[PDB]
């Protein structure tokens, strides 16, 4: 499978949203309805899957599904 597929699956699982709703342009807060706690738990779930650590101040600025995919392609090793 692809990174896009793996990342979207975790986002849908974490936020309780259906797959067809997890588009690449979608914003986590406005479009997918992520709340304060969701922000924290979603960041940690992806950090674990992709064995990486993102700085909280940088995570806070990753607003869309595609921005999250982009960060993982750039930092996963
Ligand atoms: P709550 O009211 O206490 O907190 C609400 C607010 C103040 C909105 C905070 O969530 C906050 O800091 N908001 C800043 C603007 C905003 O909505 N930013 C967040 C978008 S969602 C998010 O942070 C999830 C990112 C997931 C992708 C990261 C994956 C990287 C893994 C390596
Ligand atoms: Zn594959
Ligand atoms: Zn596939
Ligand atoms: Zn929905
Ligand atoms: Zn949008
Ligand atoms: Zn909640
Ligand atoms: Zn953190
Ligand atoms: Zn690795």
UniProtKB/Swiss-Prot annotation:
Q: Please list the GO biological process terms of this entry.
A: fatty acid biosynthetic process; lipid A biosynthetic process; lipid biosynthetic process; response to xenobiotic stimulus
Q: Does the keyword Lipid metabolism apply?
A: yes
Keyword Lipid biosynthesis part of the UniProt annotation = yes
* Domain Carrier residue range list: 1-76
Highest taxon of source? Bacteria
The pathway to which it is assigned is: Lipid metabolism; fatty acid biosynthesis
Gene Ontology terms: cellular component: cytoplasm; cytosol; membrane
Effect recorded for residue 36 to A/T:
Loss of phosphopantetheinylation, and inhibition of cell growth
Q: How is it modified after translation?
A: 4'-phosphopantetheine is transferred from CoA to a specific serine of apo-ACP by AcpS. This modification is essential for activity because fatty acids are bound in thioester linkage to the sulfhydryl of the prosthetic group.
Which GO molecular function annotations are given, in alphabetical order?
A: acyl binding; acyl carrier activity; lipid binding; phosphopantetheine binding
Residues carrying O-(pantetheine 4'-phosphoryl)serine:
36
Give the subcellular location. Cytoplasm
Record key words, sorted:
Cytoplasm, Fatty acid biosynthesis, Fatty acid metabolism, Lipid biosynthesis, Lipid metabolism, Phosphopantetheine, Phosphoprotein
Q: Which PANTHER family match?
A: ACYL CARRIER PROTEIN, CARRIER DOMAIN-CONTAINING PROTEIN
Q: Which family does it belong to?
A: Belongs to the acyl carrier protein (ACP) family.
Task: Share what the entry says about its subunit structure, partners included.
Answer: Interacts with MukB.
Its annotated function is as follows: Carrier of the growing fatty acid chain in fatty acid biosynthesis.
Looking up HAMAP family in the UniProt record yields:
Acyl_carrier (MF_01217)
Q: What is this protein called?
A: Acyl carrier protein
Q: Origin organism of this chain?
A: Escherichia coli (strain K12)
What does UniProt list as this organism's lineage?
Answer: Bacteria, Pseudomonadati, Pseudomonadota, Gammaproteobacteria, Enterobacterales
